[PDB]
Design a protein around this nucleic acid. Structure first.
Ligand SMILES: [Mg+2]
Lengths: 286, 452
RNA sequence: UGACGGCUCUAAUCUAUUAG
DNA sequence: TAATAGATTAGAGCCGTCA
């Protein structure tokens, strides 16, 4: 009665920190995080520049090569052997192997190597280009359909090819209303923080699962529809399942670049864990 | 665990409110505490149609009464501007100003928008200027109401020349009831946002009326934070046009903005995003003196924040003007690079504040994520961390992210828990947007009550 | 133009790079 | 002078209103 007393709002701080903040803070226990980063466990031991002179036409499309190769100051950037380009263009048989210049992957990746005719940053860029291009040359053999975004080239799985999943009923394809929604990934790789490969998650929509929707307004508008209720597990599983499906072996992903040599991409994402984190299991519905 | 990598954690920064007490949640503590700078009474003015003022007053007498939220845990209650902010805001006191309906029919008749927008703004600007040009009763902040979109920089730039704080209000945000689409649903669909919609406008309106809702309660002295952003405008037909911006905060009072110069750089098509050494050094001396006079103290450290990498020669110009121990750090933030993490066990995303340090310079900061007190994540999707890398200068990496979390709480436009990017850059985006309406516009005021 | 974020869609530009 | 790309950027729409 008669509430006459100095306010002393610092006391209200204590009540604020113990009435509506009961065991609601950021330092409680350990946790582990699965990243979006896929390490490159093995690189090919050799990166070679080929010296195709008057054996490939200047107007030839290098993107049509059977193996991922890039023209660079009348040299060819590819891990493949000099004799793996017979079918694409003949007359290449007049080429001697010793003419090509060979560059080891270890120093070109660690940044140790640097010369007058090529530098580290551009060498890293070319490797970035090669592994990025190698995905296009691999997705044809992995039985998935492509889709060109503004910059990237997303790939998704055709409707009904699998049992809507890869493992553990993880729904990778499905339909909403009269339209079909399909999980899809992207491709990206770079070497500065560590030799690793990026992927990104997009949902690709089709009117029945085959005949794509060309109107980008519908594709983008539908994209926000499906993600508005997706959980954190939903984004985690639909990516882990998708990568696991694309891998041809339980070890990793084989990125064929040479006739026999290739690039290994671990299917297990690079792992993180933190010392202290949140605890809250509360959820009802939405 | 050998190949496992560690995410360091940054303790949540806090802000102190009125009476000197300090709390962490801006809007939650504010009701219990009160604004840092109390303002005695607020009176405003409105320009528009008669139905606009009726809609305007119908909103004002609504927000004074307590308004709750559909998810009160996520968005806490708003008991009222009179109680939360300790001020008084009536409706009949508000200065009423009118625009004739035929005037709208007079100049909206032309379907062309390029000529209309610049001139229709002139009707908005001129009548307000004639209002508070000789009247003894000066109006604090003018609330411009827009009937329909059928504009920001075009209107604010001229009004900027007369040091008048104004807040634009689209008619939909206050009349979403009647405003319906073909299905009858509201255009903005303000079904759940109600309760929080009042929070952000009230904090904005109070800020524009001279009030300061909060300030950083964990700031060391001798440091200043400066945000530089690059903006290109298509209003100039000439391809060689790309502007810049610069912000100051002083971390204890109202912010400061100096353009230095419009700066028609090379800009082969639209821009190059690099200050020339002549302009770069000129702004910095003109920048530090603002801090020197405001705090009557010699600055010690300045954290230049940008979204682009700095070159070498601009830092040499930067480093040749700071005296004695004043060291500059280039903290460039980027939102593009993704490293989306996932919680292995559980459904909630990575909690905010955790950081991943890749080396002594670069780091990934989760300014957005999951905050426990709110029991929700401000990032609707899996949060995208902002790449923070020290472009130039030597400084402790961990100290940089510690203050970036604090700098993300100082957004007075909206009362959100934290911003995805530090307000030294978020406000800079609103800085360069407004001033590019007209090239010759100069003599820019420092106050941040307007300009946004 | 109450804000926020998270998306797609464009758009430059700056770096090797070959043809002018 | 435009192609191919990677890296690095800025606008400009649209959508969601968070367990
Ligand atoms: Mg505002």
């Amino acid at each position: 009665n008669v509430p006459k007393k100095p306010p002393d709002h610092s006391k209200s701080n204590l009540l604020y920190q113990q009435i509506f903040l009961h065991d609601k803070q950021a330092i409680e226990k350990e946790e582990t995080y699965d990243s979006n980063w896929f390490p490159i466990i093995s690189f090919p031991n050799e990166l070679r520049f080929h010296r195709y002179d008057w054996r490939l036409p200047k107007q030839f499309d290098v993107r049509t090569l059977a193996f991922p190769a890039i023209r660079y100051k009348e040299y060819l950037c590819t891990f493949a052997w000099e004799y793996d380009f017979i079918h694409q263009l003949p007359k290449t048989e007049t080429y001697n192997g010793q003419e090509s210049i060979r560059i080891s992957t270890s120093d070109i990746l660690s940044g140790r190597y640097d010369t007058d005719f090529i530098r580290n940053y551009e060498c890293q860029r070319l490797i970035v280009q090669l592994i990025n291009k190698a995905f296009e040359l691999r997705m044809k053999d992995k039985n998935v359909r492509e889709y060109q975004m503004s910059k990237t080239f997303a790939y998704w799985i055709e409707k009904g090819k699998l049992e809507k999943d890869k493992f553990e009923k993880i729904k990778l394809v499905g339909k909403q209303k009269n339209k079909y929604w399909h999980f899809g990934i992207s491709a990206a790789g770079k070497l500065y923080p560590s030799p690793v490969l990026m992927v990104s998650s997009h949902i690709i929509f089709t009117m029945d699962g085959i005949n794509l929707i060309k109107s980008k307004s519908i594709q983008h508008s539908s994209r926000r529809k499906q993600g508005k209720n997706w959980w954190n597990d939903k984004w985690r599983e639909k990516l882990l399942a998708f990568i696991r499906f694309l891998s041809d072996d339980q070890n990793a992903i084989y990125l064929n670049v040479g006739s026999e040599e290739k690039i290994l991409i671990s299917n297990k994402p690079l792992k993180f864990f933190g010392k202290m984190s949140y605890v809250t299991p509360s959820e009802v519905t939405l | 665990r050998g190949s496992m990598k560690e995410l360091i954690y940054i303790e949540e920064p806090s802000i102190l409110f009125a009476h000197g007490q300090k709390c962490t949640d801006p809007r939650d503590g504010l009701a219990l505490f009160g604004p840092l700078n109390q303002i005695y009474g607020i009176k405003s003015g409105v320009v528009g149609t008669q139905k606009g003022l009726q809609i305007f007053k119908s909103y004002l007498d609504k927000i004074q009464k307590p308004i709750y939220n559909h998810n009160n845990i996520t968005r806490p209650m708003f008991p009222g501007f009179e109680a939360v902010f300790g001020c008084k805001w009536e409706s009949q006191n508000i200065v009423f100003k009118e625009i004739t309906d035929e005037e709208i029919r007079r100049y909206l008749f032309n379907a062309s928008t390029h000529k209309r927008t610049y001139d229709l703004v002139t009707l908005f600007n001129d009548k307000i200027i004639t209002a508070n040009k000789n009247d003894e009763e000066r109006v604090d902040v003018w609330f411009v109401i827009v009937p329909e979109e059928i504009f920001h920089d075009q209107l604010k730039a001229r009004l900027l020349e007369h040091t008048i704080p104004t807040q634009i209000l689209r008619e939909s945000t206050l009349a979403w009831r009647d405003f319906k689409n073909t299905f009858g649903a509201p255009i903005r669909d303000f079904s759940k946002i109600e309760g929080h919609l009042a929070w952000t406008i009230s904090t904005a309106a109070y800020y524009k009326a001279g009030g300061k809702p909060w300030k950083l309660g964990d700031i060391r002295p001798g440091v200043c934070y400066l945000g530089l952003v690059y903006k290109k405008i298509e209003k100039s037909k000439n391809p060689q046009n790309a502007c810049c911006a610069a912000q100051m905060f002083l971390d204890n009072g109202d912010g400061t903005v100096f353009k230095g110069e419009v700066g028609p750089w090379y800009n082969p098509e639209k821009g190059e995003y690099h200050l020339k050494p002549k302009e770069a050094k000129a702004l910095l001396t003109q920048a530090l003196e603002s801090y020197k006079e405001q705090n009557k103290s010699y600055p010690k450290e300045v954290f230049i924040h940008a979204r682009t990498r700095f070159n070498d020669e601009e830092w040499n110009a930067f480093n040749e003007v700071t005296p004695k121990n004043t060291n500059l750090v280039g903290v460039t933030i980027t939102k593009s690079k993704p490293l989306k993490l996932y919680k292995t066990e559980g459904a909630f995303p990575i909690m905010r504040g955790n950081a991943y340090i890749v080396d002594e310079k670069k780091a990934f900061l989760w300014t957005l994520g999951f905050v426990p007190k709110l029991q929700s994540t401000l990032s609707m999707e899996v949060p995208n961390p902002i790449f923070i890398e020290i472009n130039k200068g030597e400084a402790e990496i961990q100290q940089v992210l510690k203050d970036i979390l604090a700098l993300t709480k100082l957004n007075y436009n909206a009362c959100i828990y934290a911003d995805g990017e530090p307000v030294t850059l978020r406000f800079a985006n609103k800085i360069g947007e407004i001033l590019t309406a007209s090239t010759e516009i100069k003599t820019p005021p420092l106050a941040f009550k307007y300009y946004i």
